[PDB]
Design a protein around this ligand. Structure first.
Ligand SMILES: OC[C@H]1O[C@@H](O[C@H]2[C@H](O)[C@@H](O)[C@H](O[C@H]3[C@H](O)[C@@H](O)[C@H](O)O[C@@H]3CO)O[C@@H]2CO)[C@H](O)[C@@H](O)[C@@H]1O
Ligand SMILES: *[C@@H]1O[C@H](CO)[C@@H](O)[C@H](O)[C@H]1NC(C)=O
Ligand SMILES: [Cl-]
Ligand SMILES: [Cl-]
Ligand SMILES: [Cl-]
Ligand SMILES: [Cl-]
Ligand SMILES: [Cl-]
Ligand SMILES: [Cl-]
Ligand SMILES: [Cl-]
Ligand SMILES: [Cl-]
Ligand SMILES: [Cl-]
Ligand SMILES: [Cl-]
Ligand SMILES: [Cu+2]
Length: 235
């Protein structure tokens, strides 16, 4: 159970974005139904009044939290990967529009899942804004908690992989459009019951065998990291 509080741009806090520039759901409950429209931008997908201005090459940092800002972030039970996707805002996340900018599953040298590292990073993870067409975009941050993912939701609706999905409204202002945005995948639709990474047993299968759900990260993506960039406590 986790939610996005807001974002930072180039290490600068853009302020509380809940229902402002984040299409926030009413609570931190997971989405589990892979076929539901809730997969796109969670359960209250609507236009919110603000969209955060950034330029290509900026660092955009999502900040997550559990109950209050900079708290335990997400229960440490919730081991799993983290991905960020982008689509143009005009799609409203419909269609084959979602392009992967970032993927982190398990780090063998540190022996930590992306979620493990997100807690250490005080809820913060980032992507570098790509050289896509200027315009309005949705950035869809997705955490998959795998602690009940030995079952499939479709088969047993009290279990299954859990998706903590948050869509940020982001306006790319300065960009040369030198890496125009390629074809995307649909959410819902990209993840199905046979998709690698959706059904997995973290308690018996080595984490080093884990493979995250495709698609693979776009070659045009400029980078990203799970790491604290700013200190909320001074805010
Ligand atoms: O059910 C067994 C699993 O529980 C996991 O904990 C979650 C609880 O199941 C869930 O009810 C609780 O939801 C809270 C939420 O955390 C809180 O922020 C919100 O205000 O109220 C919700 C309840 O209405 O979330 C916790 C996770 O934080 C365990 O992590 C898991 O190991 C366990 O097997
Ligand atoms: C999953 O979502 C689909 C599409 O909205 C819906 O028909 C189905 O009823 C959902 N499953 C459950 C258990 O709610
Ligand atoms: Cl949970
Ligand atoms: Cl609810
Ligand atoms: Cl659901
Ligand atoms: Cl709906
Ligand atoms: Cl605005
Ligand atoms: Cl808060
Ligand atoms: Cl960190
Ligand atoms: Cl540029
Ligand atoms: Cl697909
Ligand atoms: Cl980064
Ligand atoms: Cu939870």
């Amino acid at each position: 159970h986790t939610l996005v509080w807001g974002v930072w741009v180039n290490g600068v806090d853009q302020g509380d974005g809940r229902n402002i520039y984040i299409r926030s759901p009413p609570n931190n409950n997971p989405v589990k139904n892979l076929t539901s429209p809730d997969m796109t931008c969670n359960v209250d997908n609507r236009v919110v009044p603000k969209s955060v201005p950034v330029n290509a090459g900026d660092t955009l940092t999502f900040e997550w939290y559990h109950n209050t800002r900079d708290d335990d972030i997400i229960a440490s039970s919730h081991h799993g990967p983290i991905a960020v996707y982008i689509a143009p805002a005009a799609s409203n996340g419909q269609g084959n529009v979602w392009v992967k900018l970032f993927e982190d599953a398990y780090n063998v040298t540190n022996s930590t899942w992306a979620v493990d590292r997100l807690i250490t990073a005080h809820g913060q993870h980032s992507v570098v804004v790509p050289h896509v067409a200027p315009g309005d975009y949705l950035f869809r941050a997705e955490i998959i908690a795998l602690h009940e993912a030995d079952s499939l939701y479709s088969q047993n609706p009290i279990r299954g992989a859990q998706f903590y999905i948050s869509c940020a409204q982001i306006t790319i202002n300065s960009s040369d459009d030198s890496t125009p945005l390629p074809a995307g995948v649909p959410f819902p639709g990209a993840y199905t019951d046979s998709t690698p990474g959706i059904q997995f047993n973290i308690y018996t299968t080595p984490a080093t065998s884990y493979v995250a759900p495709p698609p693979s990260v776009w070659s045009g993506a400029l980078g990203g990291s799970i790491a604290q960039v700013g200190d909320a406590s001074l805010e």
